[PDB]
C-alpha cells in the first residue's frame, strides 16, 4: 500500500544509515526518480560533504545545504498558496518557488532513458547546482534594488530555457554550463537599466 510503517521497512530503517523514500505522488507526475526529498535522509551527509568539497575544491558543503533549504521553504510556501493565493503575499518568496521549481524539474528530475542524462558526472553535477542558486541570489539582488519580479522572470525565461537543457549537454563541454552562469550575471545588468 506504500505504508512505510510495515515490519520490513521499520526493522530495516533501524539498521541502516541511508533511506530513499519513494512516493506514488511523484511517480504520478512522472517525477523520476521519485525520491521524496522532504523525508528521505542520509546520516552520511555531513562526512560525504567534507570529502567532496575537498575533491572538487568548490564550496559544495555550503551549496547542498542551502539548495535543500530552498526546497524546504518551497514546501512551507505551498501550504499557504491553497489558503491565500499566489499573488497574495511574500512576493519575494515567489522567486523561491520558481527556482525550487527549477531545482526539482531541472536538477532533481533525472530521466534514466535519455542517452546523456542517464548518468551525470560529479563535475557536471556541480554546474547545474551552481547555476540555480546563483540566480537564487541574483534574483534577491534585483528585489533588493527594486526591479519588479515579472521583469526578471522574463529575463529568466530567456535563459531558463537554456538550463532546462543543461541536463542534455554532454559531459566534456562543461563550459557551456559554466558560461550560461555568466549570461545570468549579465541580464540584471541589462534589465535593471
Amino acid at each position: 500500500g506504500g505504508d512505510i510503517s510495515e515490519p520490513v521497512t521499520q526493522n530495516t530503517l533501524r539498521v541502516v544509515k541511508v533511506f530513499w523514500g519513494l512516493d506514488s505522488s511523484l511517480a504520478q507526475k512522472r517525477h523520476f526518480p521519485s525520491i521524496n526529498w522532504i523525508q528521505s535522509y542520509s546520516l552520511y551527509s555531513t562526512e560525504v560533504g567534507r570529502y567532496m568539497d575537498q575533491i572538487l575544491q568548490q564550496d559544495w558543503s555550503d551549496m547542498v545545504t542551502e539548495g535543500m533549504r530552498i526546497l524546504q521553504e518551497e514546501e512551507q510556501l505551498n501550504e499557504i498558496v491553497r489558503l491565500v493565493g499566489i499573488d497574495s503575499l511574500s512576493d519575494n518568496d515567489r522567486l523561491t518557488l520558481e527556482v525550487a521549481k527549477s531545482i526539482r524539474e531541472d536538477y532533481l528530475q533525472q530521466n534514466a532513458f535519455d542517452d546523456v542524462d542517464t548518468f551525470t558526472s560529479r563535475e557536471k553535477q556541480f554546474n547545474m547546482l551552481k547555476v540555480i542558486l546563483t540566480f537564487g541570489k541574483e534574483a534577491r539582488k534585483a528585489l533588493s534594488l527594486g526591479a519588479y519580479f515579472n521583469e526578471i522572470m522574463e529575463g529568466t525565461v530567456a535563459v531558463r530555457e537554456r538550463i532546462s537543457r543543461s541536463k542534455y549537454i554532454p559531459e566534456e563541454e562543461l563550459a557551456k554550463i559554466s558560461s550560461i552562469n555568466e549570461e545570468i550575471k549579465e541580464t540584471i545588468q541589462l534589465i535593471v537599466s
Binding site: 506504500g2 505504508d3 510503517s5 489558503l83 493565493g85 503575499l89
Partner: protein, 164 residues
Amino acid sequence: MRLNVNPTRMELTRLKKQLTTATRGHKLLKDKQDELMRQFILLIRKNNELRQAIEKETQTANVSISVVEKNIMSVKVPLMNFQYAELDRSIDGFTQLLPKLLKLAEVEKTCQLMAEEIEKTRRRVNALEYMTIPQLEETIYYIKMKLEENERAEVTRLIKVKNM
C-alpha cells in the same frame, strides 16, 4: 463527505496536524475578514458622499498623475499624486471637478478592490469551514474505526493460532 479511502496510520496523525492548520488558517482568515471589512465600511462612507457631490458639481458645470500603489496586505492600495463670465466659470467649475473627481477615483477604486477580495476570502473561509474541516474529522473517525476493527480481528485469529 468521506473523501477517499487512504488507510494508513501515520497518515491519521498527519491529518490531525492538517486539521489544526486548517483551524489556524480559518482563525487567521476570520479576523482578517473583519479587519478588511473594518476599513471597507470606513471607505464606503467616504465613497458615497464623494460620488453624489461629484454628480451635482459636474451637472451644474502638462498635467499628468503618478500613482505609486501603496499596500494593505492582500490587495494593494492606490494613492493618487498629481504632478503638474460664463465661459470662464464653466472652465473653472470644470477645474473644480479636477481635484475632486480624481479623489473619487482614489476612494472608489480602493473600495471595489477591497470588496472583491472580501468575497474571495469569504469563499475560502466558507469552503474551508464547511468542506475541508468536516471531511477531515469524519475521515479520521472512519479511519480510526477501521484499524480498531482490524486490530482485534487479528487478535482473535492469533488466539486460533495459539490454540493449534
